[PDB]
Amino acid sequence: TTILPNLPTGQKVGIAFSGGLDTSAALLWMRQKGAVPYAYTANLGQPDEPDYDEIPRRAMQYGAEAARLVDCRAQLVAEGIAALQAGAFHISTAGLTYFNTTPIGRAVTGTMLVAAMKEDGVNIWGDGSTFKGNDIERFYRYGLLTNPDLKIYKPWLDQTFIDELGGRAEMSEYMRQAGFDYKMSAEKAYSTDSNMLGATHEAKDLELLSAGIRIVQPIMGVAFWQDSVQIKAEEVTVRFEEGQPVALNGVEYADPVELLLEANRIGGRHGLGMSDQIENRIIEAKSRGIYEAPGLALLFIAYERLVTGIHNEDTIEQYRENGRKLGRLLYQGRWFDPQAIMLRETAQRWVARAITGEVTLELRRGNDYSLLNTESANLTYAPERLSMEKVENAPFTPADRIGQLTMRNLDIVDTREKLFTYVKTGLLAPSALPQIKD
């Protein structure tokens, strides 16, 4: 049994402690009911978190045996850049892409918080991830990959938990009786999960497809869909060296975390990268989200532009196929499985290491931008090599191309004969050419 349905009284239980009402009440309750809760807070560079240092302090106030802030920023940005290099994004609508920011965050917090628990002798995680979402499965897999002895306590399996803390009103009351005046956040018409890479908005009013971005207050950028909001055009240059983003606007960043924070600032002024997606959850049911990822979106445009100037068609085709495959694995919580490693490493090496260069863009509102310049010592784009002005340098002659065309004849005849066979066998209608039957 991996999933414990009852409070592990007398045992150490690790809590991924965000400091919200759910984890605050749960930690107090676990302590009051006889377990030994340990709090672990991940520093994920959340755009909406103004004071990570205060969270472990509150955990101790609520009865944590010990409370740690685990810095996950560098790992989050490293995994995000790997996802970018491998195009590991499978959710899109007319090309507008979701950058799998929650999946990446979960890969980083599942592994790193469970590792922190393991170094404290904590082999039980009290994980509140719901029975209907994706995160319960992601955390389950990342946790067991990291600690094979891990057990997971699901408080919603525990009737004692549902009976006392069955809701927000009950939780807040529970805290009050213990002498803590929990100050709830202002109610919103949706639910938000965020990290430095991006933010996701879902549930509540966003469950209705008649609602959309118009009801969202963005937390990583501005409300560009409000015509009253003023957004100044801005030019930005993004430089890559061997696939790693290294400079913005001519300023070099030794720290990729600082680079992403600046990329977020730049994209954020425009609302660059926001999208609305209906996606398929792991359990084969659909959900709807509104997404923000301004910095990754900026880096994605630049990276993709350089890929299109540097790589051949087969290479781009494999990159894109692999990316869609990898995105789905990432979403499923399989980012560290062998089949994911294969796809990720392929891109990190043969695709990304050739990506050295700069792209200059003008950002306006939302996903309206213009490309201004593309530079790279590695471009294979080189119109002068196709120049025919001077035959002394021309790469091929008219006669050469004629030869190339002639080689196509036998297979053309074969295709023509197929069309006649397809008419004879009833698949195509008789005829310029036979037509597909509708």
Positions at the binding site for L-citrulline:
98, 134, 138, 191, 200, 202, 279
User: Got the DSSP string for 347-388?
Assistant: IIIIIGGG--EEEEEEE-STT-EEEEEEE-TT----GGGG--
Answer yes or no: are the C-beta atoms of 150 and 123 closer than 8 Å.
Answer: yes
**What string of DSSP letters covers 398-435?**
HHHHHHHHHTTHHHHHHHHHHHHHHHHTTSEE-----E
Structure token pair of residue 100:
């799998």
Query: Binding of Cl ion at residue 313 (CB under 5 A)?
Result: yes
Q: Where are the alpha helices (DSSP H) in 120-158?
A: 135-146
Q: Which residues are annotated as a binding site for ATP?
A: 16-24, 42, 128, 130, 135, 193
Site string for Cl ion, 195-224 (x = CB under 5 A): x-----------------------------
Residue 60 touches which of ligand AMP, its own copies, Cl ion, none (Cβ within 5-8 Å per kind): none
Interatomic CA distance for residues 80 and 1, integer angstroms: 33
Tokens matching residue 68 = 């740690």
Q: Among 46, 172, 275, 376, which residue sits at the site for Cl ion (rule: CB under 5 A)? A: 376
Q: Gaps in the chain (C–N > 2.5 Å) come after which residues?
A: 431
Say which entry of Cl ion, ligand AMP, its own copies, none residue 73 contacts (CB below 5 to 8 A, set by partner kind).
none
Which of its own copies, Cl ion, ligand AMP, none binds 377 (CB below 5-8 Å, type-dependent)? Cl ion
53 binds Cl ion (CB under 5 A): no
Choose, by CB under 5 A, the member of 110, 271, 357, 366 that binds Cl ion: 357
Provide the 3-class DSSP secondary structure of residue 94.
coil
Contact flag: residue 193 with ligand AMP (CB under 6 A): yes
Q: State in angstroms the smallest separation of the CB of 133 from ligand AMP.
A: 8
Between the alpha carbon of residue 339 and those of residues 142, 322, 343, the distances in Å are 15, 10, 7
Q: Which does 41 bind (CB under 5 to 8 A by kind): ligand AMP, its own copies, Cl ion, none?
A: ligand AMP
288 close to 209: Cβ distance less than 8 angstroms:
yes
Is 62 within 8 Å of 27 (Cβ atoms)? yes
Binding mask 150-189 for Cl ion (x = CB under 5 A): ----------------------------------------
**Least distance CB 41 / ligand AMP (angstroms):** 4
Closer to ligand AMP at the Cβ: 79 or 193?
193
* Shortest reach from residue 228's CB to Cl ion, in Å: 32
Task: Tell me whether residue 229 is exposed, middle or buried, using C-beta atoms within 10 angstroms of its C-beta: 0 to 12, 13 to 18, 19 or more.
Answer: exposed
Per CB under 5 A, 386 contacts Cl ion:
no
**Of positions 4, 14, 21, 23, contacts ligand AMP by CB under 6 A:** 23
> Is residue 377 a contact point for Cl ion (CB under 5 A)?
yes
Helix (H, G, I), strand (E, B), or coil: what is residue 311?
coil
Judged by CB under 5 A, does residue 327 bind Cl ion?
A: no
Closest-approach residue to ligand AMP (CB): 16
**Binding to ligand AMP in span 129-168, by CB under 6 A:** 129, 135
Between CA 25 and CA 63 the distance in angstroms is 11
Written as six digits, the tokens of 133 are 């979402």
Residues that bind ligand AMP (CB under 6 A): 16-18, 22-23, 41-42, 44, 109, 128-129, 135, 193
